């Protein structure tokens, strides 16, 4: 298709490896580019950890208000929100918001701990029918993004389907789903990624990811004004370990997808 030729050209121009999955919920049609190749998730994995905690809260009704102590030892490499609460507490709701909206790595590690380790995050993925997602490590080492390493990867197709289920489907309870959507819509890190390739009138909720090997990711739910929502996953990684982030590639892929409808 025209869109796949343009995505392939974008990829060729970029020097890296691009993975795209679009789901149009209007007719359940899919557009895939390297849709079944594995990519390092980096912080896009935080959506799964937050959703897993939300699932727990369907039975433990007060779970999200549980306070969790932030100690100096908990701080890792990127903790914009947790740093503000060292020697204090944050609720699991505040940690979920911080992980999603600021990509806080300490918050992610607390969510992983709440789930019993990376295996508990992966278990949630399996429980909602995602056989591809795997979380193997905690922050910050899950971002090493080593070529060929299957740890902490998923495929664009799998992540698109899972994000659809979590946000637009009913993998979560009604209140939990709405909370996740609210959190994603309030993301603060996504202005230069998928959002930048789309009409300004469209509502977007997204989660970015960045890691070594210039890994630059964004996963989004998109609500166009007067039109069925779309799920768009854009993963990008590069051959040099110290490569710079390329958020412009994700914006461009989004623009190409948006043009083609």
Ligand X SMILES: *[B@@]1([O])O[C][C]([C][O])O1
Residues that bind ligand X (CB under 6 A): 42-43, 77-78, 103, 105, 140, 143, 209-211
In whole angstroms, how close is the CB of 114 to ligand X at the nearest point?
19
Structure tokens at 59: 């039975």
Q: Between residues 11 and 139, which has the closer beta carbon with respect to ligand X?
A: 139
Q: One of 1, 13, 43, 210 is an active-site residue; which one?
A: 43
Q: Between residues 33 and 235, which has the closer beta carbon with respect to ligand X?
A: 235
Cβ–Cβ < 8 Å for 70, 88: yes
Cβ–Cβ < 8 Å for 143, 40: yes
Helix (H, G, I), strand (E, B) or coil at 202: coil
Query: Could you tell me where the beta strands, DSSP code E, fall in 98-229?
Result: 153-154, 203-211, 215-223
Helix (H, G, I), strand (E, B) or coil at 244: coil
In whole angstroms, how close is the CB of 194 to ligand X at the nearest point?
15
Q: Between residues 78 and 213, which has the closer beta carbon with respect to ligand X?
A: 78
Cβ–Cβ < 8 Å for 143, 43: yes
In whole angstroms, how close is the CB of 103 to ligand X at the nearest point?
4
d(CA 243, CA 228): 37
In whole angstroms, how close is the CB of 121 to ligand X at the nearest point?
15
d(CA 185, CA 165): 16
Q: Between residues 77 and 241, which has the closer beta carbon with respect to ligand X?
A: 77
43 is catalytic: yes
Which residues are known catalytic residues? 43
């Amino acid at each position: 298709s025209a869109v796949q030729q343009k995505l392939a050209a974008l990829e060729k121009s970029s020097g890296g490896r691009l993975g795209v999955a679009l789901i149009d919920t209007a007719d359940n049609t899919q557009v895939l580019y390297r849709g079944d190749e594995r990519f390092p998730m980096c912080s896009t994995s935080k959506v799964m950890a937050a959703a897993a905690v939300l699932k727990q809260s369907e039975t433990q009704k007060q779970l999200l208000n549980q306070p969790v102590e932030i100690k100096p030892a908990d701080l890792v490499n990127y903790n914009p929100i947790a740093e503000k609460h060292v020697n204090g507490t944050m609720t699991l709701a505040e940690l979920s918001a911080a992980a999603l909206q600021y990509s806080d790595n300490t918050a992610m590690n607390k969510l992983i701990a709440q789930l019993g380790g990376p295996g508990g995050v992966t278990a949630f993925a399996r429980a909602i029918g995602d056989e591809t997602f795997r979380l193997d490590r905690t922050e910050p080492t899950l971002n090493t993004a080593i070529p060929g390493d299957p740890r902490d990867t998923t495929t664009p197709r799998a992540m698109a389907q899972t994000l659809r289920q979590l946000t637009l489907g009913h993998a979560l309870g009604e209140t939990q789903r709405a909370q996740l959507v609210t959190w994603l819509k309030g993301n603060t890190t996504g202005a230069a990624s998928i959002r930048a390739g789309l009409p300004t009138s469209w509502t977007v909720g997204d989660k970015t990811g960045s890691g070594d090997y210039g890994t630059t990711n964004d996963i989004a739910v998109i609500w166009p004004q007067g039109r069925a929502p779309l799920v768009l996953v854009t993963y990008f990684t590069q051959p040099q370990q110290n490569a710079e982030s390329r958020r412009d590639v994700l914006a461009s892929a989004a623009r190409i997808i948006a043009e083609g409808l």
